[PDB]
Amino acid sequence: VDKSSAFEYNKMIGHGINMGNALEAPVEGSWGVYIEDEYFKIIKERGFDSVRIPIRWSAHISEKYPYEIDKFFLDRVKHVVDVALKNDLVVIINCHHFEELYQAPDKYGPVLVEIWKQVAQAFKDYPDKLFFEIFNEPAQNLTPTKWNELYPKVLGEIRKTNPSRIVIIDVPNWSNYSYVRELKLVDDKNIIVSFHYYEPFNFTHQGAEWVSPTLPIGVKWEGKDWEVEQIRNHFKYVSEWAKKNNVPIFLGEFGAYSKADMESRVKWTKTVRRIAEEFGFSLAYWEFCAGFGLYDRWTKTWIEPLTTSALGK
């Protein structure tokens, strides 16, 4: 009962949640979310295994080479990781919302490499329950090809100081399930591949004003046979690819915006969770609070049964 290490670490992700709209804002708090230490105790008590923390490193570095991360910001992230590990959560820290990387990856890929050299150096001695995640949702001009070229350079710098730490590699083109086949792997035994799931997009993003054109509301999701089979077909495609490529899969984000009717949200979330479990995917719901949120910060209570849909208990 030799077992693959990466697959075992992926199981440690288990059922997780994203602590979003916070450190990936230009300044934490400017989108209305600020991470309280108590949040991690709350998350763990509810029964989540892990937390995924979006971080806009690129908003907190020197303007010139080698792009030193601002001390105050690195200290903040270290504090937040410390508290989550203190509450016995597995923690995934990423880089997120690097707008210039999406537009000019030839110019800004090297900046990502330098960010990661620093973050890896800073976290090198942290327990193995901290995982790194090179970049959220490659897309736009960071095409599958450019990403396949870039992420191994970043991984190389990470591996200098963190030879075995789990590093999560995102599927390109916004991490949409269907682009899994465009991802080229490397010979590294401590990687996990991640995709994000928001289909039907006109359901999960109805009424979201940041989408162009804003999509009509009133779109239902009813748990009919055909609706469930659409999701199963999608996740089967990822599962067959992952088995062929000998790599574990983390469904790093999934969720339906609050402008969707609640019963639909509850049914969709539960179905996605069950189908991810059926294929052996770990998973993180998007997100703790804000527009897709499970936790009502005002009442200091979980929204139910939506939370149970995401977590399964």
Side-chain angles (χ1 to χ4, degrees), residues 10-74:
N10 189 52
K11 278 171 96 294
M12 290 171 46
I13 299 175
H15 294 60
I17 197 171
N18 281 272
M19 265 274 50
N21 276 54
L23 283 156
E24 79 289 25
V27 174
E28 192 191 355
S30 70
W31 291 350
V33 186
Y34 179 79
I35 305 170
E36 300 177 21
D37 286 3
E38 69 188 80
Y39 286 177
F40 300 112
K41 174 182 173 177
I42 290 162
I43 293 171
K44 178 67 179 189
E45 304 176 292
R46 182 60 180 83
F48 291 98
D49 305 298
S50 65
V51 55
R52 172 165 182 264
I53 309 178
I55 309 171
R56 184 196 301 212
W57 295 105
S58 62
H60 299 102
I61 47 170
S62 179
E63 336 78 47
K64 216 50 271 303
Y65 195 87
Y67 310 115
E68 228 80 82
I69 301 173
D70 299 330
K71 173 170 193 300
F72 173 87
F73 189 73
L74 181 53

